[PDB]
Design a protein around this nucleic acid. Structure first.
Lengths: 50, 66
DNA sequence: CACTATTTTCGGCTACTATAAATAAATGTTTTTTTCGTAACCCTTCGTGGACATTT
């Protein structure tokens, strides 16, 4: 058990799930920054990496 | 893009909820769609001292125009 | 080996870039005013009895 799956499971496997997947679920919920003046301007965040 | 209405059998000569106001972005959206899509390489946007300045190159004059 | 041909290069053309003066007028650009937890305990309320006046 402790060889494949150590004693700091609860700290290491949490941040490693934040970096891999749980960043892409943030920019996909804050994409498309817009302006009301000059309405043909748009900036969108497609993907994110660390 | 004026105000539109409709003929409902229930409510005749009724005014619709959506065209009351305008989006002001859908007509901007189609304008953007037929634009060129370029992939930026960091060497293209190179700037020097001869950048963001006055002037151009005049066409060298001809004997016709003399 | 002959010349085609992009590469290498000369080359000059051009166009301000500072630095000092005349206005003069137009233009934009930015500051200084002027104004729009438990427990007492006061507090609040429902209430009950006293006497006065009209009326029988």
């Amino acid at each position: 058990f402790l060889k494949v799956k150590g004693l700091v499971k609860q700290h290491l496997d949490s941040f490693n799930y934040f970096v891999d997947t749980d960043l892409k679920k943030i920019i996909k919920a804050n994409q498309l920054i817009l302006s009301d003046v000059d309405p043909e301007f748009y900036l969108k965040y497609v993907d994110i990496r660390v | 893009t004026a105000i539109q209405l409709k003929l409902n059998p229930d409510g005749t000569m009724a005014i619709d909820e959506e065209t009351m106001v305008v989006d002001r972005h859908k007509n901007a959206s189609i304008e953007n769609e037929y634009k060129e899509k370029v992939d930026e390489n960091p060497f293209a946007n190179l700037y020097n001292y001869g950048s963001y300045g006055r002037g151009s190159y005049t066409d060298p004059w001809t004997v016709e125009e003399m």
